[PDB]
Ligand binder design. Structure first.
Ligand SMILES: CCCCCCCCCCCCCCCCCC(=O)OC[C@H](COP(=O)([O-])OCC(O)COP(=O)([O-])OC[C@@H](COC(=O)CCCCCCCCCCCCCCCCC)OC(=O)CCCCCCCCCCCCCCCCC)OC(=O)CCCCCCCCCCCCCCCCC
Ligand SMILES: CCCCCCCCCCCCCCCCCC(=O)OC[C@H](COP(=O)([O-])OCC[N+](C)(C)C)OC(=O)CCCCCCCCCCCCCCCCC
Ligand SMILES: CCCCCCCCCCCCCCCCCC(=O)OC[C@H](COP(=O)([O-])OCC[N+](C)(C)C)OC(=O)CCCCCCCCCCCCCCCCC
Ligand SMILES: CCCCCCCCCCCCCCCCCC(=O)OC[C@H](COP(=O)(O)OCCN)OC(=O)CCCCCCCCCCCCCCCCC
Ligand SMILES: CCCCCCCCCCCCCCCCCC(=O)OC[C@H](COP(=O)(O)OCCN)OC(=O)CCCCCCCCCCCCCCCCC
Ligand code: HEM
Ligand code: HEM
Lengths: 379, 31, 52, 56, 445, 98
């Protein structure tokens, strides 16, 4: 005689996961993005399936098959644009999630933070391959530009490119290869997300105040399930507005042109959620240095738990660190804006300033501010 | 230990007041 | 961190594990040359270079 | 016995065990490739392209 | 007066030897008491399967009666002068020692001569003594540490005389007639394999002349030809598990081959053993003891008591540990205890080696306190080493031990050597022998 | 002077508005957790209640009225001695392991 909820194995796992899991009482709305990620993932796993059900992978039928999905498949355009803009929704939620983890000092959960960095890398790679899939002008040329970075790697680098290209340039082989990789990767992302939830549950969530809330804990099911339902409703509102009213708002029109290797578009820009890093790439003339800075721009999150010097955990009671964090966010937005514009005056110097300031804020300004911070409070 | 013989039981009586002792790296003892 | 790990007996432990770590690194180098089939190095080992 | 000398020399340390395995990988790979290829060319002598390229 | 000054001032161990072969060895001091005993080289090692248990029976009947003193009269003489008479029989040595005042030396030596020589061995007393040993066998069965160590010896030196228990199987003790014991006495209680030791207010000249006038009748021959030789004993790395879930606590003893009484490698290994240390639930050191295993056990309340041993015989020994812990700790200590050993086999800091050296010096100097421990030391050393090791020599051998020596000797005796596990009680969680043997080597090294 | 800057910072920090004391806002590492365990019962109970009230207020996104704000002068230092002792013991352990 017992609850099958807390005695049946699968039901026990579900119960400890998101039914009776002790959650902090004062969890703000910024935590909802966690689920808003998973839901997006599910949606991305869902619609992509129904896209792979009418998408070939040959360069003679890639663009034509995409147009077929948009124009002929019954309600196929809904799925297509739902995928295209759910990618942007996924990345908006991802960036807000990373910002939340940074602000409230959630990176003290070392295992979960590192797993999150791995998830970020995997999601970025998957999105890159997916954008390569429709074989537009943007697709082909962005793929060439991005993959040609690996030629900068010493020694093996050139070979590596010819390995990934499956030949001598982004061509028939690379399209199908990227299709297979874009299919497989999200399931690896799902497995890593499960591991991430495991690691987080071994310690419990962190409240905005940054202090342990083991005394004021509430069951997850009656409260945070409905909170997450509301969050999902809001995210669906934004995503459906995007898809139904202005689908080609976050995209680039040149992607609606068959890929022609003999002519390039006026501008070669990546998707928006990548520009913040692309600008950093453009900052350093040294190509190898550019690639290294590109990798470090994401790998910095790994070092972030080490740099924590403040006695307090979060930023709720650290106004100086708050201004620093918002300086960082403005800097990321500036890099995103810089990435779109061509390599001309004054975008070049502004891009160098923004890229320098990003690492200066993360590595130097924040720890020194925390050091001054503790001194300002007798500790 | 279980004692079920005169020879083994010999000496198990007490003739001096009980004296306990504990240490830092030596196990507890009593006599 | 580095204040704690900088010690007499800590450097002594480092010295103790120097041989094992160094020849673990040698293990890794040989395995890398083998699996990769690094022709630049394998052209000098007498018997194996006959393969190319 | 030689096996005792082998154990005391190359097998006691796990890392030395791995080094022995790695070098054995090189030499066994080369020797086995030579042997198997030679056996195959012997079995089908005169049919492979290697055995008939000379006349063209 | 520094430590070194005191060491070269400890009285010497004057050693003599009568014509028959009995080695007389004394150690004068100023105490008014003394401790005189005879250390024979009998023991379970010198016993075949047919007569195993003879030594225990002979030790039992030693104080019962003699030809000169018919019986209880001997006990009356011993008690009238306040002497405490004792005897301990092991797997290698058997000894009788009288603890008496210096003035009662002439009488005490006479009493020891009567026991070791003119022992009655009356059949009626044999029958009376037969039951006592049987009861003592059940008592020892209740002694769980002793049964675990007997399991260790049985499963380690299997098929060799060392595996035989000192008391003997409770079948030989029920058939050991007078005839079997008499051969044991006439074949093992010989003058060459005997050491007459004494310590305290004893004069070496007095001990020599008392021995000459009492033990002269001792014989050195070996009847027709039978000379019981020394049989080397093989160490077969194995395991034995007597799982009895009713027992409240589980005892596990694991030991590898250690050296003999020779092979000075004992001195480094003991230091290594001292580094592992020993713990009991009633220590009070808590999570502060220098020994890593002791600190972990105290922190997690893992075990009730773990002790490291270096049992050492003439040509081989059992060097290792024995721990008493509940059912859900046996594996965990197997992880830590082994994890400790390999640390000394791969990285032993000089600091802990110095600590082990100091602990060993303290153990040696403290164990030789009191006349009875000194007499035991003399009797045991003359049989094992052939000479009493002066404490100064012990100090020198300890000083020569450093971190590199400990690492080398441990890797020579511990690393990748099949153990001799032996477990009793609720030992279900005890790792399988393959797991233990795997834990005997580290994949980092 | 400097103490004026420190008072301005205490006011702008915001943990006074929640009724929290300085030490309630500290991150709970191993040293801090052991220090909290070491606290006397009467201090620990007040610490727990203050923390729970603060979490309640932040859940409802509110602050206490201005009168019940922990003043800079009244901000006692309860966890400081215990944390200092714990840090000293850890430093001793690390130095001995050195
Ligand atoms: C006043 C006019 C401007 C209001 C927005 C900016 C502002 O100062 O917000 C302060 C404040 C949010 O920040 P906070 O309460 O100071 O700090 C707690 C966290 O924001 C977390 O508080 P929360 O869990 O209650 O979430 C509130 C948040 C909800 O934010 C989200 O759900 C994520 C952002 C996308 C929506 O609402 C916001 O407006 C913040 C994000 C958008 C700012 C523009 O919001 C309001 O006072 C009203 C918000 C509702 C709109 C009216
Ligand atoms: C660094 C590890 C070795 C890389 C390498 O190129 O090894 C040589 C071998 C064979 O190349 P190779 O020896 O003919 O020439 C090496 C130099 N490059 C590559 C510039 C021509 O490399 C590989 O087989 C794969 C290299 C990439 C994966 C590592
Ligand atoms: C997948 C489908 C096919 C699966 C079956 C076929 C493939 C596996 C077959 C063999 C599996 C067992 C043997 C693998 C090697 C191994 O670790 O054995 C156990 C053994 C068990 O240990 P051991 O006792 O044999 O040896 C270590 C102990 N000393 C040092 C004393 C000898 O593992 C090792 O020996 C550890 C070292 C392994 C090193 C491996 C990498 C070397 C090359 C690096 C470059
Ligand atoms: C997805 C995660 C949430 C759902 C799974 C976890 C929650 C438990 C689901 C089952 C349940 O609540 O009831 C099953 C029900 C029998 O329930 P009962 O035995 O009355 O009470 C003990 C607990 N079930 O089984 C029955 O047959 C009752 C009637 C079911 C509906 C018809
Ligand atoms: C959103 C804009 C409004 C906003 O952030 O207002 C500030 C408000 C303050 O939140 P509170 O927890 O009360 O801070 C302590 C106050 N004493 O709210 C916050 O500070 C919450 C916003 C910061 C923490 C969440 C992460 C937001 C990240 C946004 C940019 C993402 C991309 C860059 C970072 C990666
Ligand atoms: C694949 C995308 C991701 C999914 C599905 C995911 C899933 C989740 C979920 C559901 C939560 C709990 C809700 C929450 O606290 O927000 C969570 C917590 C967390 N995630 Fe993620 N996550 C993702 C990406 C990331 C990334 C990129 C990072 C940063 C490197 C990260 C770091 C964290 C941290 C630190 C927490 C704990 C937050 C706290 O305790 O306050 N996650 N994750
Ligand atoms: C990790 C979640 C995913 C992300 C972020 C993602 C992202 C993207 C992006 C950005 C595109 C290009 C959209 C465009 O053409 O403008 C795309 C296309 C595509 N994705 Fe995904 N995707 C995800 C998961 C999946 C999965 C799981 C599948 C397979 C079931 C899939 C199949 C496809 C297909 C077939 C296309 C080509 C159709 C098209 O481009 O419109 N995707 N994806």
């Amino acid at each position: 005689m017992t609850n099958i909820r807390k005695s049946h194995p699968l039901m026990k796992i579900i119960n400890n996961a998101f039914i009776d899991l002790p959650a902090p009482s004062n969890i703000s709305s910024w935590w909802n993005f966690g689920s808003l990620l998973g839901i997006c993932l599910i949606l991305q796993i869902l619609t992509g399936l129904f896209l792979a059900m009418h998408y070939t992978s040959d360069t003679t039928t890639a663009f034509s098959s995409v147009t077929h999905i948009c124009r002929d498949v019954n309600y196929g355009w809904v799925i297509r644009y739902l995928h295209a803009n759910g990618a942007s929704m996924f990345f908006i939620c991802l960036f807000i999630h990373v910002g939340r983890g940074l602000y409230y000092g959630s990176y003290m959960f070392l295992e979960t933070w590192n797993i999150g960095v791995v998830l970020l890398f995997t999601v970025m790679a998957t999105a890159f391959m997916g954008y390569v899939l429709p074989w537009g002008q943007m697709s082909f040329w962005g793929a060439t530009v991005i993959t040609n970075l690996l030629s900068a790697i010493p020694y093996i680098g050139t070979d590596l490119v010819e390995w990934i290209w499956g030949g001598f340039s982004v061509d028939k082989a690379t399209l199908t290869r990227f299709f297979a990789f874009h299919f497989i990767l999200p399931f690896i992302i799902t497995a890593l997300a499960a591991v991430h939830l495991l690691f987080l549950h071994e310690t419990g969530s962190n409240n905005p105040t940054g202090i342990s809330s083991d005394m004021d804990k509430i069951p997850f099911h009656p409260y945070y399930t409905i909170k997450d339902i509301l969050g999902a409703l809001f995210m669906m509102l934004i995503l459906l507005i995007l898809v139904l009213f202005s689908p080609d708002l976050l995209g680039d029109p040149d992607n609606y042109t068959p890929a022609n290797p003999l002519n390039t578009p006026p501008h070669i820009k990546p998707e928006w959620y990548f520009l913040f890093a692309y600008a950093i790439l453009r900052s350093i003339p040294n190509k190898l240095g550019g690639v290294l800075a590109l990798v470090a721009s994401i790998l910095i999150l790994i070092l972030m738990p080490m740099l924590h010097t403040s006695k307090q955990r979060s930023m709720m009671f650290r106004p100086l660190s708050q201004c620093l964090f918002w300086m960082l966010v403005a800097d990321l937005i500036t890099l995103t804006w810089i990435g779109g514009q061509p390599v001309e005056h004054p975008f070049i110097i502004i891009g160098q300033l923004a890229s320098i300031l990003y690492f200066l804020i993360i590595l130097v300004l924040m720890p020194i501010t925390s050091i001054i911070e503790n001194n300002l409070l007798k500790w | 230990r279980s004692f079920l013989c005169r020879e083994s039981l010999s000496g198990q009586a007490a003739g001096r007041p009980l004296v306990a002792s504990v240490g830092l790296n030596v196990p507890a003892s009593v006599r | 961190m580095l204040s704690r790990f900088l010690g007499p007996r800590y450097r002594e432990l480092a010295r103790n594990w120097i041989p094992t770590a160094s020849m673990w690194g040698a293990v890794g180098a040989v395995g890398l040359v083998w699996a990769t089939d690094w022709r630049l190095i394998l052209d000098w080992v007498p018997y194996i270079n006959g393969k190319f | 016995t030689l096996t005792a000398r082998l154990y005391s020399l190359l097998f006691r340390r796990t890392s030395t065990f791995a080094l022995t395995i790695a070098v054995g990988a090189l030499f066994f790979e080369r020797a086995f490739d030579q042997g198997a290829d030679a056996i195959y060319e012997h079995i089908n002598q005169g049919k492979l392209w290697k055995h008939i390229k000379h006349k063209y | 007066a520094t430590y070194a000054q005191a060491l070269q001032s400890v009285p010497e161990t004057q050693v003599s030897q009568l014509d028959n072969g009995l080695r007389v060895a004394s150690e004068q001091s100023s105490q008014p008491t003394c401790t005189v005993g005879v250390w024979i080289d009998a023991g379970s090692r010198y016993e075949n399967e047919k007569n195993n248990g003879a030594g225990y029976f002979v030790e039992h009947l030693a104080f019962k009666g003699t030809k000169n003193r018919p019986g209880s009269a001997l006990e009356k003489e011993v008690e009238s002068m306040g002497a405490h008479l004792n005897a301990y029989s092991t797997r290698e040595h058997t000894a009788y020692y009288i603890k008496a005042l210096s003035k009662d030396l002439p009488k005490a030596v006479e009493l020891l001569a009567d026991i070791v020589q003119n022992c009655s061995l009356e059949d009626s007393q044999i029958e009376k003594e037969r039951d006592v040993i049987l009861q003592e066998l059940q008592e020892n069965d209740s002694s769980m540490r002793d049964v675990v160590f007997d399991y260790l010896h049985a499963t380690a030196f299997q098929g060799t005389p060392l595996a035989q228990s000192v008391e003997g199987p409770s079948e030989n003790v029920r058939k050991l007639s007078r005839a079997d014991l008499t051969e044991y006495v006439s074949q093992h209680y010989k003058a060459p394999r005997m050491v007459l030791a004494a310590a305290g207010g004893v004069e070496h000249r007095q001990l020599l002349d008392l021995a000459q006038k009492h033990f002269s009748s001792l014989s050195g021959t070996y009847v027709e030809d039978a000379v019981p030789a020394f049989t080397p004993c093989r160490f077969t790395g194995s395991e034995i598990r007597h799982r009895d879930d009713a027992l409240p606590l589980a005892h596990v003893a694991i030991a590898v081959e250690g050296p003999g009484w020779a092979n000075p490698d004992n001195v480094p290994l003991q230091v290594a053993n001292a580094i592992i240390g020993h713990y009991d639930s009633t220590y009070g050191g808590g999570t502060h003891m220098s020994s890593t295993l002791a600190s972990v056990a105290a922190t997690r309340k893992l075990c009730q008591s773990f002790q490291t041993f270096n049992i050492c015989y003439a040509e081989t020994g059992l060097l290792g540990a024995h721990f008493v812990c509940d059912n859900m700790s046996i594996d965990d200590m197997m992880f830590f205890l082994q994890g400790q050993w390999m640390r000394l086999c791969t990285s032993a800091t000089e600091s802990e080696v110095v600590r082990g050296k100091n602990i060993l010096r303290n153990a040696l100097v403290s164990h030789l306190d009191g006349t009875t421990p000194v007499c035991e030391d003399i009797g045991r050393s003359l049989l094992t080493y052939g000479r009493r090791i002066p404490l100064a020599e012990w100090e020198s051998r300890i000083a020569e031990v450093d971190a590199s020596v400990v690492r080398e000797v441990c890797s020579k005796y511990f690393y990748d050597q099949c153990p001799a596990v032996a477990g009793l009680g609720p030992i279900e969680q005890l790792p399988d022998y393959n797991r233990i043997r795997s834990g005997m080597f580290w994949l980092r090294f | 002077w400097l103490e004026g800057i420190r008072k301005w910072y205490y006011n702008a920090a915001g943990f006074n508005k929640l009724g929290l004391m300085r030490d309630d806002t500290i991150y709970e590492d191993d040293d801090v957790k052991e220090a909290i365990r070491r606290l006397p019962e009467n201090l620990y109970n007040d610490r727990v209640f203050r923390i729970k009230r603060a979490l309640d207020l932040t859940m409802r996104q509110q602050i206490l009225p201005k009168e019940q704000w922990t003043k800079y002068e009244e901000d006692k230092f309860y966890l400081e001695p215990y944390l200092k002792e714990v840090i000293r013991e850890r430093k001793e352990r690390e130095e001995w392991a050195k």
